[PDB]
Amino acid sequence: GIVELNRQLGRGVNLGNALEAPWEGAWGVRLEEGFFELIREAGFKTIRLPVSWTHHAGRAAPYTIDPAFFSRVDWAVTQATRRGLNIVVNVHHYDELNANPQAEEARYLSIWRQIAERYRNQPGSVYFELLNEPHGRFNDNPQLWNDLLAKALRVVRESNPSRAVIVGPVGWNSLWRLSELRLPDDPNLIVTFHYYDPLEFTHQGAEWLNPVPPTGVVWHQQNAIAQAMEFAQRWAEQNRRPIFVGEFGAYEKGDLDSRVRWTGAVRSELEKRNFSWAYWEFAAGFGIYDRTTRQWRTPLLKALVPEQPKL
Numbered sequence: 596g597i598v599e600l601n602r603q604l605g606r607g608v609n610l611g612n613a614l615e616a617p618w619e620g621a622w623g624v625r626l627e628e629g630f631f632e633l634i635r636e637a638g639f640k641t642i643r644l645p646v647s648w649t650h651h652a653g654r655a656a657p658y659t660i661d662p663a664f665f666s667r668v669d670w671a672v673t674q675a676t677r678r679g680l681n682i683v684v685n686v687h688h689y690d691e692l693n694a695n696p697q698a699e700e701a702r703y704l705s706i707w708r709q710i711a712e713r714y715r716n717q718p719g720s721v722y723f724e725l726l727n728e729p730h731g732r733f734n735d736n737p738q739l740w741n742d743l744l745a746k747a748l749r750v751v752r753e754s755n756p757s758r759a760v761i762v763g764p765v766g767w768n769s770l771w772r773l774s775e776l777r778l779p780d781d782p783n784l785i786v787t788f789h790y791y792d793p794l795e796f797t798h799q800g801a802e803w804l805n806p807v808p809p810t811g812v813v814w815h816q817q818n819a820i821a822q823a824m825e826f827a828q829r830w831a832e833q834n835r836r837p838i839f840v841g842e843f844g845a846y847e848k849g850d851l852d853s854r855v856r857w858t859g860a861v862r863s864e865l866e867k868r869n870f871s872w873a874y875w876e877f878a879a880g881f882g883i884y885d886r887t888t889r890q891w892r893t894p895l896l897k898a899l900v901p902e903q904p905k906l
């Protein structure tokens with residue numbers, strides 16, 4: 596059942612700064628086959644694969660996805676699956692859809708029909724995730740996302756009757772917006788949120804924000820993580836949905852010891868609440884792996900995969 600499929604997600608990592616950029620490598624990470632074994636042998640069971648399909652799909656109906664790009668996603672799905680990893684395939688950045696859900700609906704639903712039909716025979720280790728971090732007009736009216744996600748789920752279910760589908764709330768997948776999330780009566784949904792609080796710490800010096808948070812911010816644990824994860828767990832129990840926290844992480848412009856405190860505190864609380872999770876992210880500015888030296892960032896890796904359960 597879906598609770599077991601969520602438990603199977605377990606510990607995971609995002610292949611970020613890759614296929615969710617305008618093109619693969621634009622944000623600094625080209626995928627390599629060797630990433631999959633590296634990630635598996637470090638203790639992760641799952642790859643989350645951010646994919647920004649909008650850059651690669653026709654603007655006019657039937658909104659066909661570029662065949663070469665589609666073949667690259669095929670390759671990632673197959674290489675992860677054969678090497679024993681789960682893979683979450685999403686729709687990631689989509690500025691057009693967050694800005695104008697009604698105008699972009701047809702194109703988004705065509706994208707999901709293409710993905711769903713193409714991958715309908717994949718095993719249960721392949722998961723679909725309808726839309727990363729809804730924001731924009733979805734923040735103004737969260738019911739626009741409730742209505743749209745039901746339409747996208749219906750499309751997926753025409754070809755994938757029982758595949759696990761991962762759905763999050765608005766406010767960029769804020770757990771506080773679970774209150775406004777409404778889901779169909781479908782027994783194979785996993786609910787997701789992302790956790791980056793405090794943004795002033797995790798995104799200090801991130802230039803893709805407006806405003807850009809200042810650096811020099813340190814962090815130590817108080818009670819906010821526990822309060823947040825308990826709120827989310829009670830929502831999940833009230834609504835009988837399993838939970839996957841699909842992104843959490845702290846940017847490299849913060850001091851390393853603070854990032855390690857934060858990463859371990861979050862991972863510990865996630866696992867206390869039986870939330871599966873995926874770290875943001877493998878190899879870039881939040882990375883646990885440095886491709887330049889071909890070395891793990893051991894303090895951060897051990898905060899995710901501790902050698903003893905209380906470490």
Ligand SMILES: N[C@@H](Cc1c[nH]c2ccccc12)C(=O)O
Pocket residue numbers: 612622623624878879880881882885886887
């Ligand atoms: N310095 C590492 C990791 C890294 C830091 N910032 C990045 C931005 C994009 C991609 C990678 C990175 C590298 O160049 O690989």
Ligand SMILES: OC[C@H]1O[C@@H](O)[C@H](O)[C@@H](O)[C@@H]1O
Pocket residue numbers: 612622803879880
């Ligand atoms: O979201 C846009 C930005 O996201 C960041 O994670 C990436 O590092 C940037 O390269 C990118 O421009």
